[PDB]
Design an enzyme around this catalytic site. Structure first.
Site, mmCIF file in Angstrom:
data_model
loop_
_atom_site.group_PDB
_atom_site.id
_atom_site.type_symbol
_atom_site.label_atom_id
_atom_site.label_comp_id
_atom_site.label_asym_id
_atom_site.label_seq_id
_atom_site.Cartn_x
_atom_site.Cartn_y
_atom_site.Cartn_z
ATOM 1 N N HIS A 480 0.822 -1.197 0.000
ATOM 2 C CA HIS A 480 0.000 0.000 0.000
ATOM 3 C C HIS A 480 0.863 1.257 0.000
ATOM 4 O O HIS A 480 0.938 1.954 -1.018
ATOM 5 C CB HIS A 480 -0.972 -0.018 1.181
ATOM 6 C CG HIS A 480 -1.645 1.293 1.421
ATOM 7 N ND1 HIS A 480 -1.515 1.981 2.604
ATOM 8 C CD2 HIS A 480 -2.440 2.054 0.628
ATOM 9 C CE1 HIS A 480 -2.213 3.101 2.537
ATOM 10 N NE2 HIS A 480 -2.780 3.166 1.350
ATOM 11 N N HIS A 485 1.099 5.049 -2.922
ATOM 12 C CA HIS A 485 1.332 6.408 -2.421
ATOM 13 C C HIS A 485 2.727 6.963 -2.694
ATOM 14 O O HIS A 485 2.881 8.006 -3.342
ATOM 15 C CB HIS A 485 1.090 6.445 -0.914
ATOM 16 C CG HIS A 485 -0.340 6.398 -0.544
ATOM 17 N ND1 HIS A 485 -1.064 7.538 -0.269
ATOM 18 C CD2 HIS A 485 -1.184 5.356 -0.382
ATOM 19 C CE1 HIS A 485 -2.302 7.197 0.034
ATOM 20 N NE2 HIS A 485 -2.396 5.880 -0.017
ATOM 21 N N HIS A 671 -3.882 0.399 -6.629
ATOM 22 C CA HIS A 671 -4.194 1.011 -5.352
ATOM 23 C C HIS A 671 -5.590 0.612 -4.885
ATOM 24 O O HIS A 671 -5.791 0.269 -3.718
ATOM 25 C CB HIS A 671 -4.072 2.528 -5.454
ATOM 26 C CG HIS A 671 -4.587 3.223 -4.250
ATOM 27 N ND1 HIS A 671 -5.834 3.796 -4.220
ATOM 28 C CD2 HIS A 671 -4.076 3.350 -2.998
ATOM 29 C CE1 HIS A 671 -6.055 4.293 -3.016
ATOM 30 N NE2 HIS A 671 -5.011 4.029 -2.254
ATOM 31 N N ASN A 675 -6.388 -1.235 -1.358
ATOM 32 C CA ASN A 675 -6.887 -0.266 -0.393
ATOM 33 C C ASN A 675 -8.313 -0.524 0.077
ATOM 34 O O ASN A 675 -8.585 -0.462 1.272
ATOM 35 C CB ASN A 675 -6.828 1.149 -0.969
ATOM 36 C CG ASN A 675 -7.211 2.180 0.058
ATOM 37 O OD1 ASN A 675 -6.498 2.371 1.043
ATOM 38 N ND2 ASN A 675 -8.362 2.809 -0.125
ATOM 39 N N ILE A 820 -6.949 8.398 -1.339
ATOM 40 C CA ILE A 820 -7.061 8.195 0.094
ATOM 41 C C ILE A 820 -6.078 7.101 0.487
ATOM 42 O O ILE A 820 -5.735 6.917 1.657
ATOM 43 C CB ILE A 820 -8.517 7.840 0.510
ATOM 44 C CG1 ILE A 820 -8.677 7.865 2.042
ATOM 45 C CG2 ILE A 820 -8.935 6.498 -0.054
ATOM 46 C CD1 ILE A 820 -8.519 9.268 2.657
HETATM 47 FE FE LIG Z 1 -4.315 4.536 -0.005
#
Ligand SMILES: [Fe+2]
Length: 820
Positions: A480, A485, A671, A675, A820
């Site tokens: 993750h 990110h 992602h 996520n 997010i």
């Molecule tokens: Fe995330």
């Protein structure tokens, strides 16, 4: 000689997390800039200051919070055709400009500007804000009267690498992760700088410029706000959609409040049975009035919990118990979640036995597996037959965890093993765990085999928990945080520094960056900082982020492409006779099988978009913005790895396709897949423990006797304690929620992002295929032959790669970006 225009803007208060007549008069000037007539120095002619005239209430297409203004530009025959405009805000308050539309001008009859930018008072800007029409131009096609404006706006976005960045700045640049520690508050909070060395290589992040601490000039001082360039810091029409600020409130307000209640000893410190854990979503937990009073008014936080407003707090029921409260305890589900769970992309195929370690034996000793072939139950197969028929797979964390277990096991409330799990692909296509190896340095290994009866059935249940603690750590910090990110942010920075808003590849990629720098900055402040949310809830504590730097050493850009990943992990083989060019070795593998459909859809879109602007390999080579962009993304953004031979060179059409395809894949489906399953699978802490606190009990001790008599207590004493559980459940509930203003794969936030009708048509058919794929995936989940892996004993259909989603905690929907 008057051109009628329409401006659409949003007053600041509409987009804040918490009259129009002031905009008229002489409060907001726009000046048009010619695309076709130049001054003496070759720059497009600039028109006169023109002010907003009146409100346009009879505009039907307005959205929520938007207001429209009428304006008329005097523009005579010497001025040519407008292609840009300056805007100056003379008000004291900033506003959010959406668009400008000019009517009855040019051979197209209408000229459209899509701006989506924050415009502060003209005094705060060194140069005047400029916006371009919605045409798309590679550099050598820029109308000559605009070339200089294009180059100057990019210079403005790069800055010079100096100064403290302020809220209104739009300056994009790189710095290392030297802002996570806080050695000026305590040497205990000192953290290593990640990036800029060979020991601790890491992607770069957005530069903020706050200056050095006094105790360590290598570390950046703290600040109340972590800067991002202004148009990265998304406002929202609804405060409940500001999910990204929840981690800040959770760390700064909620967590201290929870800690107070526990120190008060008003609630029991520990779970004492599994029912104590299930109570969290059934009847709830009783907390003091003081603590509830801290939650119920906070935006975002107030949506995570049901409450009666006085003493009761209640979490939502996690999907993984919606049908069978106990199914998570089955070996079947344990294995199934390695190909259809929150972290579905680490399992490997095994081609030799026993598994070997790559760590240096002079330092670690013999690390070769102690699992014996003859000890396994392979449903009648021999080891040779299982290896040869590609039915052996491993979830291996030994080499990742072993160089850190000594340091972790010295922490007060942490104990861990480095683990290996062996999995056998049964004839029915489901995986079966057949052995877990639990290792300690200096090496000591215990092999645990599956058991359903007696004390050995508890040792096996605990062994699974140690494996999942490994997997949870790896998921959160590598699958993750590191791979989505952190790996993406350098490409966001380089894109704004080096590709003009006018550039076709800027328009292709930037929707897939939405909110990424924003959440990353807030994460550096409250999520992965010293004593932040990760450090105080997940196993490795203060070593957490440095572990992800150790793994980044093995990160390879081209191995993030989904087919390359599947081949690298030995779960698929090259096969040109198949639709996708790869044949899965676990046929029904739900993440990979659905992911290949999404991957193929993105590929067609990129393959149909890029040739509209690049006809031949030489056009790619001779695009100076594109060449500077990629050079800087590698040499600066991922600069600690700039000497690796696998970086594409960007000399051909085929390279540009693959570079953009991989970036889009990472930001969207990869992602999403890692996520949005976090709370659905991990909202039960027993299923996805974040930490282990003790090793296995020794025979003859009270703890061992407890195991025999009270296995639920033995399990809970080993995993995440109650207080960190409440914090971690809250943070993954936020991460698993879709904001109502999300933009999903196949959608854009404005229909006029380019004037090129061929690009619009290609984008329309992309969105059409995504709808076709969704119907195909729905069918897969209703196929009885696929239930064993797509639904499992928890009866939870695999929907994480459905493209579309409504708001909320839905376990589906692929956003464009890491939002997010
Ligand atoms: Fe995330």
């Amino acid at each position: 000689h008057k051109i009628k225009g329409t401006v659409v803007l949003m007053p600041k208060n509409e987009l804040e997390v918490n009259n129009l007549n002031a905009f008229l008069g002489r409060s907001v000037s726009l000046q048009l800039i010619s695309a076709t007539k130049a001054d003496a120095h070759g720059k497009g002619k600039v028109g006169k200051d023109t002010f907003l005239e009146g409100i346009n209430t009879s505009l039907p297409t307005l959205g929520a919070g938007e207001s429209a203004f009428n304006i008329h530009f005097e523009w005579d025959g010497s001025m040519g055709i407008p292609g840009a405009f300056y805007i100056k805000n003379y008000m004291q308050v900033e506003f959010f400009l959406k668009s400008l539309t000019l009517e009855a001008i040019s051979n197209q009859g209408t000229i459209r500007f899509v701006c989506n930018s924050w415009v502060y008072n003209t005094k705060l800007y060194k140069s005047v804000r400029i916006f371009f029409a919605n045409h798309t131009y590679v550099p050598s096609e820029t109308p000559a009267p605009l070339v200089e404006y294009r180059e100057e706006e990019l210079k403005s976005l790069r800055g010079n690498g100096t100064g403290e960045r302020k809220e209104y700045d739009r300056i994009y640049d790189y710095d290392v992760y030297n802002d996570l520690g806080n050695p000026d508050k305590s040497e205990k909070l000192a953290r290593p700088v990640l990036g800029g060395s060979s020991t601790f290589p890491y992607p770069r992040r957005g530069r903020t410029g706050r200056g050095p601490t006094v105790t360590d000039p290598n570390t950046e001082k703290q600040g109340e706000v972590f800067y991002v360039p202004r148009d990265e810091n998304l406002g929202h029409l609804k405060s409940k959609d500001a999910l990204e600020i929840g981690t800040k409130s959770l760390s700064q307000i909620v967590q201290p409040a929870f800690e107070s209640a526990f120190d008060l000893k008003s609630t029991p410190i520990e779970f004492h049975s599994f029912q104590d854990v299930h109570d969290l979503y059934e009847g709830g937990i009783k907390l003091p009035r003081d603590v509830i009073s801290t939650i119920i008014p906070l935006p975002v936080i107030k949506e995570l919990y049901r409450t009666d407003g006085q003493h009761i707090l209640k979490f939502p029921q996690p999907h993984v118990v919606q049908v069978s409260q106990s199914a998570w305890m089955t070996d079947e589900e344990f294995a199934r979640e390695m190909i259809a769970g929150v972290n579905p992309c680490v399992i490997r195929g095994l081609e030799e036995f026993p598994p070997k370690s790559n760590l240096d034996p002079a330092i670690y000793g013999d690390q070769s597996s102690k699992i014996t072939a003859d000890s396994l139950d392979l449903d009648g197969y021999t080891m040779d037959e299982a290896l040869g028929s590609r039915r052996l797979f491993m979830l291996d964390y030994h080499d990742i965890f072993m160089p850190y277990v000594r340091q972790i096991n010295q922490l007060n409330s942490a104990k861990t093993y480095a683990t290996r799990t062996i999995l056998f692909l049964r004839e029915d296509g489901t995986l079966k765990p057949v052995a877990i190896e639990l290792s300690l340095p200096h090496a000591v290994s215990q092999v645990v085999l599956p058991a359903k009866e007696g004390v050995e059935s508890t040792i096996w249940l605990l062994a699974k928990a140690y494996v999942i603690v490994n997997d949870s750590c790896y998921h959160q910090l590598m699958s993750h945080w590191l791979n989505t990110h952190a790996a993406m942010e350098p490409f966001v920075i380089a894109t704004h520094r080096h590709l003009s808003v006018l550039h076709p590849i800027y328009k292709l990629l930037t929707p897939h960056y939405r909110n990424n720098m924003n959440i990353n900055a807030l994460a550096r402040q409250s999520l992965i900082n010293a004593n932040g949310i990760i450090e105080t809830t997940f196993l490795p504590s203060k070593y957490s982020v440095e572990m992800s730097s150790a793994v980044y050493k093995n990160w390879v850009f081209t191995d993030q492409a989904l087919p390359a990943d599947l081949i690298k992990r030995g779960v698929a083989i090259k096969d040109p006779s198949t639709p996708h060019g790869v044949r899965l070795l676990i046929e029904d593998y739900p993440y990979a099988a659905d992911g290949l459909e999404i991957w193929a859809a993105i590929k067609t879109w990129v393959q149909e978009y890029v040739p509209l602007y690049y006809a031949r390999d030489d056009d790619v080579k001779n695009d100076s913005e594109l060449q500077h962009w990629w050079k800087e993304a590698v040499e600066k953004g991922h600069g600690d790895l700039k000497d690796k031979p696998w970086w594409p060179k960007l000399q051909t059409l085929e390279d540009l396709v693959e570079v953009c395809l991989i970036i889009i894949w990472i930001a969207s489906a990869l992602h999403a897949a890692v996520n949005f399953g976090q709370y659905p699978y991990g909202g039960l802490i027993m299923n996805r423990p974040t930490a282990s606190r003790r090793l296995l009990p020794e025979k003859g001790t009270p703890e061992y006797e407890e195991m025999i008599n009270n296995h639920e207590k033995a399990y809970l004493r080993t995993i995440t304690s109650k207080l960190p559980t409440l914090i971690s459940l809250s943070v993954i509930e936020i991460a698993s929620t879709h904001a109502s203003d999300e933009v999903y794969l196949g959608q854009r936030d404005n229909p006029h992002w380019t004037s090129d009708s061929k690009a619009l048509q290609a984008f329309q058919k992309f969105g059409n295929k995504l709808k076709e794929i969704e119907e195909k995936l729905v069918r897969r989940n209703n196929d009885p032959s696929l239930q064993g892996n797509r639904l499992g004993p928890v009866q939870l259909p695999y929907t994480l790669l459905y493209p579309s989603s409504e708001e909320g905690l839905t376990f589906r929907g692929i956003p464009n970006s890491i939002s997010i």
